[PDB]
Design a protein around this ligand. Structure first.
Ligand SMILES: [Cl-]
Ligand SMILES: [Cl-]
Ligand SMILES: [Cs+]
Ligand SMILES: [Cs+]
Ligand SMILES: [Cs+]
Ligand SMILES: [Cs+]
Ligand SMILES: [Cs+]
Ligand SMILES: [Cs+]
Ligand SMILES: [Cs+]
Ligand SMILES: [Cs+]
Length: 115
């Protein structure tokens, strides 16, 4: 019977990464999570293929900061004791930070399950 894909639009959210302000979004094919520093006219500094993402975590509501943390699959010759690569994005929209985190989280979780 029927097959449905997510139809919510791709958001562009104000976020800090490694203490630099930028924009977190997805590529138009919804296959990469990309973060670009402001002004966001250059190339992404982070490009994470959703196929390589193994975990999605968040600060709980009421935390000092609204953060999503994405974990990637270990690099090929990483040592077996080493932590996996991780990426923390702090949402900085003065009123909508948590809403915006929620929207990205929901869209990513849907895409990750659909693959
Ligand atoms: Cl919150
Ligand atoms: Cl949910
Ligand atoms: Cs936005
Ligand atoms: Cs995945
Ligand atoms: Cs997983
Ligand atoms: Cs907060
Ligand atoms: Cs490894
Ligand atoms: Cs990192
Ligand atoms: Cs901001
Ligand atoms: Cs699937």
């Amino acid at each position: 019977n029927l097959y449905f894909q997510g139809a919510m639009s791709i958001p562009r959210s104000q976020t800090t990464y490694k203490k630099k302000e930028g924009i977190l979004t997805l590529t138009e094919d919804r296959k990469f999570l990309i973060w670009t520093p402001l002004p966001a006219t250059g190339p992404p500094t982070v490009s994470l293929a959703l196929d390589n993402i193994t975990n999605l975590q968040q600060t709980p509501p009421g935390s000092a900061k609204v953060i999503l943390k994405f974990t990637e699959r270990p690099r090929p010759n990483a040592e077996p004791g080493a932590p996996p690569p991780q990426y923390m994005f702090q949402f900085t929209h003065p009123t909508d930070a948590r809403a915006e985190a929620n929207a990205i989280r929901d869209l990513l979780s849907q895409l990750l399950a659909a693959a």
